[PDB]
Amino acid sequence: GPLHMIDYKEIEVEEVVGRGAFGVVCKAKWRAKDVAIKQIRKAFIVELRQLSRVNHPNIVKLYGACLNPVCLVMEYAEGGSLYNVLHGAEPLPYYTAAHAMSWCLQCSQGVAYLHSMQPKALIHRDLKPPNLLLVAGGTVLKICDFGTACDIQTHMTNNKGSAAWMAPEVFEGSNYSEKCDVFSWGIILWEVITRRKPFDEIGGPAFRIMWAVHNGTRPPLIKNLPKPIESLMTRCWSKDPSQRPSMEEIVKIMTHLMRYFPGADEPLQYPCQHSLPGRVEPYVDFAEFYRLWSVDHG
Numbered sequence: 001g002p003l004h005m006i007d008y009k010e011i012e013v014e015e016v017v018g019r020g021a022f023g024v025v026c027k028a029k030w031r032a033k034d035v036a037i038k039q040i041r042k043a044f045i046v047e048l049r050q051l052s053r054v055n056h057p058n059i060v061k062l063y064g065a066c067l068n069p070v071c072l073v074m075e076y077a078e079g080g081s082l083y084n085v086l087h088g089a090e091p092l093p094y095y096t097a098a099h100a101m102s103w104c105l106q107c108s109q110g111v112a113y114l115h116s117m118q119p120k121a122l123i124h125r126d127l128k129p130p131n132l133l134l135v136a137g138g139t140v141l142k143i144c145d146f147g148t149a150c151d152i153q154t155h156m157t158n159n160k161g162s163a164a165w166m167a168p169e170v171f172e173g174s175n176y177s178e179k180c181d182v183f184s185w186g187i188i189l190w191e192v193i194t195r196r197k198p199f200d201e202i203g204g205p206a207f208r209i210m211w212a213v214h215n216g217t218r219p220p221l222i223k224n225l226p227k228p229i230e231s232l233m234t235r236c237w238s239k240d241p242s243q244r245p246s247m248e249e250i251v252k253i254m255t256h257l258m259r260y261f262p263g264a265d266e267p268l269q270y271p272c273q274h275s276l277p278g279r280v281e282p283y284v285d286f287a288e289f290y291r292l293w294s295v296d297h298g
């Protein structure tokens with residue numbers, strides 16, 4: 001994995017866009033290109049090595065590192081976090097079923113890559129919309145890993161944590177595999193389809209959500225959701241990791257559903273005035289899906 005050595009003189013820092021845990025992410029410029037830089041010593045060696053080994057369109061690009069001061073240099077995500085597109089400050093952008101399905105397809109392709117690496121696979125173990133970034137007018141999605149928490153107080157048991165998207169076996173303290181990322185992906189699918197924060201009904205501190213998920217609570221089912229999308233979604237939620245699909249299988253299934261979801265290449269340009277009403281209604285609209293389905297199967 002080749003990598004550019006960067007003299008800190010060449011960087012011109014523009015703004016700060018994330019301060020949590022083990023560094024401060026910042027917008028900057030470098031040889032024309034807009035870049036994102038994370039300033040910090042220990043695990044940096046492992047991350048820098050991993051972040052150079054990866055080469056996939058749906059995982060964020062590493063241009064290189066500056067060894068003094070010790071910081072990563074990567075492509076800037078103009079579109080920002082998916083979380084911020086979904087639930088950020090107003091005005092939030094309008095999006096479609098096709099966008100929602102494409103973002104989950106793209107995320108799954110990135111994760112399938114991570115799980116297929118050799119000799120050992122990379123397990124992300126922290127997939128959630130804050131670590132999913134958007135580019136190309138919101139059309140393209142790239143996985144990253146900010147790693148938002150460490151201290152139990154002002155991180156892991158709060159809104160800057162990740163218990164809503166976490167697999168039971170991880171927070172349970174049991175052994176886990178790459179199937180933990182499949183659970184997370186299942187939750188993200190529900191999230192983009194509904195534009196609801198998962199387990200916002202429960203809330204409180206994170207241990208309340210962990211308690212509910214450990215007993216078997218899942219996000220509510222979605223009204224009028226196609227059965228194949230509901231099958232794939234609810235399988236990823238499975239308590240037993242053995243019953244969850246592989247990311248390889250998800251990529252195949254999703255790749256073929258996109259036939260019934262044209263228009264994902266349309267960039268995010270229209271505004272939205274979003275307000276929230278057993279089951280729950282989707283934000284996106286599945287009417288054209290059923291229409292195109294009927295034509296193929298009829």
Ligand SMILES: CC(C)Oc1cc(C(=O)N2CCN(C)CC2)ccc1NC(=O)c1csc(-c2cccc(NC(=O)Nc3ccccc3)c2)n1
Nearest residue numbers: 017018025036038050060074075076077080081144145146
């Ligand atoms: C809050 C941040 C996250 O996410 C961002 C949020 C915004 C944002 O919300 N803004 C607010 C201001 N407005 C004006 C624009 C929108 C902007 C940029 C980034 N970040 C990035 O562009 C970026 C690119 S790489 C990266 C990053 C940051 C920290 C760590 C890593 N590391 C990895 O990706 N590691 C890794 C990935 C896969 C496998 C192994 C390691 C990347 N961040």
